[model samples]
Target: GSHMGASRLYTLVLVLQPQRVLLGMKKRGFGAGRWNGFGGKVQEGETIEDGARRELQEESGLTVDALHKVGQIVFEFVGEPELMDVHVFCTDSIQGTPVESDEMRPCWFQLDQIPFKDMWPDDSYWFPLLLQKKKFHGYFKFQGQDTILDYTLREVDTV
Candidate 1:
């Protein structure tokens, strides 16, 4: 017998939005229709770190050098028991301004007006920690739409 395993590296990005976060039209995916920074899945033979940087460029058209690789999240499903690792990063420095896209209708939204409802339930739990000058790493076990299980939330030093 063979094992069924799956892995995806997400670039959870947060760039400088001194004015407002440019929200893009939500495409169909795990987290769609939300005002997220920029990111995507890792391709074959691609490191999570590299994927993080590449995804940022593809989604937001932003070229950046300094990436704050803050933390990671592990999501496990019961059906296939698949393991997915989401790599979260923050960057205060990036190149170019945001522009609209075919998939994402880019529009600026006030930082306070971030559309959390459009994202995963888990996001509301930890996103604030990132804003409060903390880098967090944690795990979530989801059954359907609920986080039925949890793990330790550790803060990593970004400085």
Candidate 2:
């Protein structure tokens, strides 16, 4: 009568640049030149927070201790039968500076001075909410990395 429900987790490191974060040339990896938070798909049987901290360390070569569970995003698509429950976390207490690995090189951008052109289009919609000290939720329908529909709701305001 019922089927399996899948879960996904995401770790977003809210690294404060206090200046402009720079991205290196795209010679390798998907986001070689773009500046973004460190995260990846959550693994099975792991807590969302654990996955977040794990991916953060694996991707950025740094450890983030102080973390805050900010919000969640539900990604529903037409072709896929399963729904993706994405957990978003943020923190500024980074253990070490970002170092370039196989995936991406890390850089910082000052508040209100981030380069959105090089980032995912959807990021522009929700990232600011975190900085504004507001909690939020986002629903996104994606077609192979392209946003078909996106609706976000904030805690202090109406959708």
Candidate 3:
């Protein structure tokens, strides 16, 4: 068994409007090649919301006007000691047009056209809850890079 260690905190920000959600094609690092939301690590002295807002700008050039903490998810790899604690946020208002950065290719998807097959396996489970404006908490154990061996998702009043 892999020895457990302290969990690392990260943030994920989803930009949503009337009929679409903003996603990015990661160009490098973990989760590369997947269609996902914009965000990254919460720096040593930064607030979670601020980290999410900062990552959004770094990856997609969009500035968040306001962020709603909609979910929290813990990801554990089957044989790895490390864990990822992700703070999920959503924003309906933004300040700039998305421009692709070295880290991501920015794009938008219609409500019915989200390319879930091109996203993280666990996303299909919790993403809909966000669209429905529900807060949630989730736990996912992965067998490999793309396969979720087991997961639990639950709606909450606040996350």
Candidate 4:
């Protein structure tokens, strides 16, 4: 069962409204040039929820009063030892206007207009669950950083 090495925790926060969702275009680093939920690595001293909030604020300049833990996904990159255990969070409202940062450019899209083709390959599989207000768990094995070689996603009563 120890097929992958140490798993590092990360966070991905989606800001949702009645009809739209907020997504960020990564400016650089691991997921550069791709649109994704706002998030990054969880720091040692903070809770996962805290890390999600921090990343959302840092990347989009938006603060959330509440966050629902909606899903969890394990991402394994082929040939890499480390796996990314990402906690997915969602919120309905935010405290400030989103501003682009050096790390990401913030944008909002209607629920039906999500740019799945320009996002992480695994997103299309599970994002709809989030939009439906359902909880889920997923595992995605990637071929390097882009292609999803294998995966499974299922709805759950709780995350």
Cα TM-score per model: 0.77, 0.76, 0.95, 0.95
Each prediction's total of clashing residue pairs, residues at least 3 apart in sequence or on different chains, is 2, 7, 0, 0
**lDDT, model 4:** 0.90
- Using lDDT, give the best candidate's number: 3
Which residue pairs collide, candidate 1? 25-105, 26-33
Model 1, position 106: C-alpha lDDT score: 58
lDDT of 2 by residue, 95-119 (tens): 8876776675666667677777777
User: On residues 1-159, what C-alpha lDDT tens digit does candidate 1 reach at each position?
Assistant: 122366665666766456555546556565455556667678888887688777767766777778877667777666645577778877777678866654455566676876777657776767777666587877777776545565556676641
What's model 3's overall lDDT? Answer: 0.91
Return whichever of 3 and 4 wins on lDDT. 3
Please provide, for model 4 over 1-159, each residue's C-alpha lDDT reduced to its tens digit, 9 standing for 90 to 100.
233568999999999899999899999998798999999999999999999999998898889899989999998888888888999998987999999999999999999999998998888889988888899999999986788888888888877
Question: RMSD in Å for candidate 3, one decimal?
Answer: 2.5
Clashing pairs in 4: none
Cα lDDT listed for each candidate = 0.67, 0.65, 0.91, 0.90
lDDT of 1: 0.67
For all predictions, the C-alpha RMSD in Å is 4.3, 4.5, 2.5, 1.6
